[PDB]
Design a binder for this molecule. Sequence first.
Ligand SMILES: *[C@@H]1O[C@H](CO)[C@@H](O[C@@H]2O[C@H](CO)[C@@H](O)[C@H](O)[C@H]2NC(C)=O)[C@H](O)[C@H]1NC(C)=O
Ligand SMILES: *[C@@H]1O[C@H](CO)[C@@H](O[C@@H]2O[C@H](CO)[C@@H](O)[C@H](O)[C@H]2NC(C)=O)[C@H](O)[C@H]1NC(C)=O
Ligand SMILES: *[C@@H]1O[C@H](CO)[C@@H](O[C@@H]2O[C@H](CO)[C@@H](O)[C@H](O)[C@H]2NC(C)=O)[C@H](O)[C@H]1NC(C)=O
Ligand SMILES: *[C@@H]1O[C@H](CO)[C@@H](O[C@@H]2O[C@H](CO)[C@@H](O)[C@H](O)[C@H]2NC(C)=O)[C@H](O)[C@H]1NC(C)=O
Ligand SMILES: *[C@@H]1O[C@H](CO)[C@@H](O[C@@H]2O[C@H](CO)[C@@H](O)[C@H](O)[C@H]2NC(C)=O)[C@H](O)[C@H]1NC(C)=O
Ligand code: NAG
Lengths: 97, 597
Amino acid sequence: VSGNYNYLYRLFRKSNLKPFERDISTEIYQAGNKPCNGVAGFNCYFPLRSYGFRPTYGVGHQPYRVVVLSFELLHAPATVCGPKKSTNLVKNKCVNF
Amino acid sequence: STIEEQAKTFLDKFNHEAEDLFYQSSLASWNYNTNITEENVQNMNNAGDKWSAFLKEQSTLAQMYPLQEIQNLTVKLQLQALQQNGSSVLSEDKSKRLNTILNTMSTIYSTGKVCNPDNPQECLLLEPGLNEIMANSLDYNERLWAWESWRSEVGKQLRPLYEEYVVLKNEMARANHYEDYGDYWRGDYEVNGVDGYDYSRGQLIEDVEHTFEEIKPLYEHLHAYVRAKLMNAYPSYISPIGCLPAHLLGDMWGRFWTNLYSLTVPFGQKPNIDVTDAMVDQAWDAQRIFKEAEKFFVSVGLPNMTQGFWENSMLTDPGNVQKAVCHPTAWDLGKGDFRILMCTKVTMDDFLTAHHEMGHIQYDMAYAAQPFLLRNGANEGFHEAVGEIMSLSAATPKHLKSIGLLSPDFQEDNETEINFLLKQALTIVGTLPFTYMLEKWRWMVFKGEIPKDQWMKKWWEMKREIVGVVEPVPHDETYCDPASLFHVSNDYSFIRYYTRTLYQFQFQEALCQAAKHEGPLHKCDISNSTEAGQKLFNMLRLGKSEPWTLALENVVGAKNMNVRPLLNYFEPLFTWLKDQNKNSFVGWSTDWSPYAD
Ligand SMILES: *[C@@H]1O[C@H](CO)[C@@H](O[C@@H]2O[C@H](CO)[C@@H](O)[C@H](O)[C@H]2NC(C)=O)[C@H](O)[C@H]1NC(C)=O
Ligand SMILES: *[C@@H]1O[C@H](CO)[C@@H](O[C@@H]2O[C@H](CO)[C@@H](O)[C@H](O)[C@H]2NC(C)=O)[C@H](O)[C@H]1NC(C)=O
Ligand SMILES: *[C@@H]1O[C@H](CO)[C@@H](O[C@@H]2O[C@H](CO)[C@@H](O)[C@H](O)[C@H]2NC(C)=O)[C@H](O)[C@H]1NC(C)=O
Ligand SMILES: *[C@@H]1O[C@H](CO)[C@@H](O[C@@H]2O[C@H](CO)[C@@H](O)[C@H](O)[C@H]2NC(C)=O)[C@H](O)[C@H]1NC(C)=O
Ligand SMILES: *[C@@H]1O[C@H](CO)[C@@H](O[C@@H]2O[C@H](CO)[C@@H](O)[C@H](O)[C@H]2NC(C)=O)[C@H](O)[C@H]1NC(C)=O
Ligand SMILES: *[C@@H]1O[C@H](CO)[C@@H](O)[C@H](O)[C@H]1NC(C)=O
């Protein structure tokens, strides 16, 4: 409650990103024609805002946590694979093992 | 930097910040409204201050982008709405003078005190008792006193202030390329350059004066009936060719004739439909009524409630002593956080008010995707319009006997239908002449046609000509009668209550002509249909993103307000009134006076 202003999200950039790329700069945007010289104001906007989360929000505005997995087999032949499990062992019986 | 790319990229930032801040302000306000304390006033005033300062700074900044180099419609509309100077174009000291005159007018109206000539020590305010005296008393003398007093003590003080108020507002509006103030009000119905959907500021007056012409055939008969009926309670006080005395209508100003139902009921021994004991005999709480309203709304094909509205909203007044102004309201704190503040009791009237408010809740749920500056109705009128049709469709006997509040064998007849229809027409078509008269009078006095030494004479000759009511006591030019109405002395527009009365029945007919109804329109219901829900929702979700004359044509199919649905809704009552006046004299002669005899 009262606002949790830690999480930011960029909403100004020159051109869209590249897949799996990362950009963390904090250079002041420039939309107009006159160079900014690093001062906010007219046509010189800060590039970072913050999600102000509160418990009294509706669905679609409450903070969601997202995780993504991504595999890639550069060339490994025996890396991390799946796991396995049990199946009661017996003896003195013709069995398929 | 395409000379416009600058507008878009500004607009975004603005959008975000705006929304956020506004929310802070609004939560703050809901707070103070639901929990009245001394510190909460401070907790909300500074939030409102920060919001106002931010908005006025953004308004001062948005000027730097000219308005003719924009090509996209929505961004142009957003800038045109934000770029408005409003006030503060005046000289600085004159701005403070205007604030003082407005606040002094509001205060003098609020804390008015009138006292009896027989007992001047303890006496009456306006809200407690004066409305009760003017509504429930039955003696001519007491009503005439209660009427002349409030206009002799609150009408005399307000004229020398209203005089300066008019000229100050005119000098304000005349700096934004406007020619008077009334035009600055009519500017809400303006639409420019959309190739056919345009709506000039002038044509509003034309429509109004063109649609008031078709109402008179019904209003004349209603006036004749009400007059020939009032000729019973006060014998030999009215003339059968005259007008009515202003202090016999039912309230302080003659705006609603609804309190005349006790004197002019058609069949005084056939009670109307009323589910009030059947409710409490079923042990219904405040939860059950809202559940019923939500079930009705979801039956037509609209979404549920947001599941954040059942835990935050305050449906019943807090048990302990918790001062919270008990006046229903639908809050849209934004961010999809909708609430309803109302002190519900177990009465069918609150059962209808719940529908009327969840109407606004749904209408606000629809357009939550538009940019923040376009989160309103199409104009000032559509909001309560789309709200009221739910209450008009939930009060029919069909929807009642389909919910378990009427005995299944309840058989309705034409007597009860005429009773209900007159109870409705005493409020719907009764206020229209007064509304149109007052709004035209204000437009006239603002444009400068009426010299300031002929205000009251013109106002009273208008009350004689248009609406059909006459003052009981002469009034020279030290008075000001209109300054005694809340929506006048507080700088509130007063034309919406005339366009809403038409939009209401237009929406009703346009919608339930899709529900495949066949009978008269006053039994028509919108339950269980899905075409009706779609027709409504394809307009609910536009907001201000499209000109209102398109929001209409996508529901009814016309490009303006038309009065024909209203008369088609009242046709049975009109057929009856055409018979019950075979012997009286329809109309009124503006020569009769209550004192010149
Ligand atoms: C209504 O507002 C008052 C004013 O703050 C609240 O009273 C105090 O609120 C603080 C806020 O946490 C509590 O810590 C105190 O215990 C409260 N004291 C008293 C005497 O009330 C009050 O709680 C508010 N009402 C509700 C229902 O929240
Ligand atoms: C400029 O106008 C165009 C249409 O004239 C807008 O395009 C629409 O944009 C919304 C989202 O912004 C989309 O959902 C619609 O599908 C678009 N319409 C079409 C026909 O593709 C555009 O959004 C406007 N610019 C801005 C900044 O709002
Ligand atoms: C709003 O008020 C301003 C004065 O504060 C009017 O004058 C314009 O002000 C802006 C910046 O303050 C200047 O860039 C313009 O040159 C001024 N003159 C214009 C626009 O003619 C402004 O005109 C007012 N807005 C409107 C729509 O008239
Ligand atoms: C309500 O309906 C009833 C029956 O349909 C009407 O009763 C008849 O009304 C006509 C109208 O002039 C009379 O000529 C008949 O004599 C009535 N029937 C009987 C048996 O007397 C009744 O009039 C309708 N209500 C109103 C107000 O017209
Ligand atoms: C119209 O809507 C009502 C409201 O739900 C439906 O009412 C049901 O009607 C059936 C049979 O008529 C009853 O067995 C149910 O108990 C009713 N439900 C409730 C909650 O009362 C009705 O079915 C709808 N009309 C149609 C044709 O489906
Ligand atoms: C609305 O809520 C009811 C809960 O009674 C649920 O059964 C229904 O599926 C919901 N409908 C929608 C469209 O969310």
